[PDB]
Structure formats: C-alpha cells, structure tokens
Copies of this chain bind each other. A is one copy, B any other.
C-alpha cells in the first residue's frame, strides 16, 4: 500500500503552502 504513504506527504505540501503568510 504505497499509495497511503504517498498521500501522507503530498497533501502536506498543500498545508505548508497555506502557512506562507506569516
């Protein structure tokens, strides 16, 4: 199940992106 680990850190790049108005 290499697809769950791939979604664990690919929608974690969308979040850190949300962080960049600090």
Contacts and interface: CB of A to CB of B under 8 A. Distances in A.
State which size class the interface on A falls in: under 10
7 contacts: A11-B12, A11-B15, A12-B15, A14-B15, A14-B18, A15-B15, A18-B18
Interface string A6-22: 00000110110010000
A11 to B, nearest CB: 5
A15 to B, nearest CB: 5
Nearest to A7: B12
A18 B11 CA distance: 10
A14 to B, nearest CB: 5
Contacts of A18: 14, 18
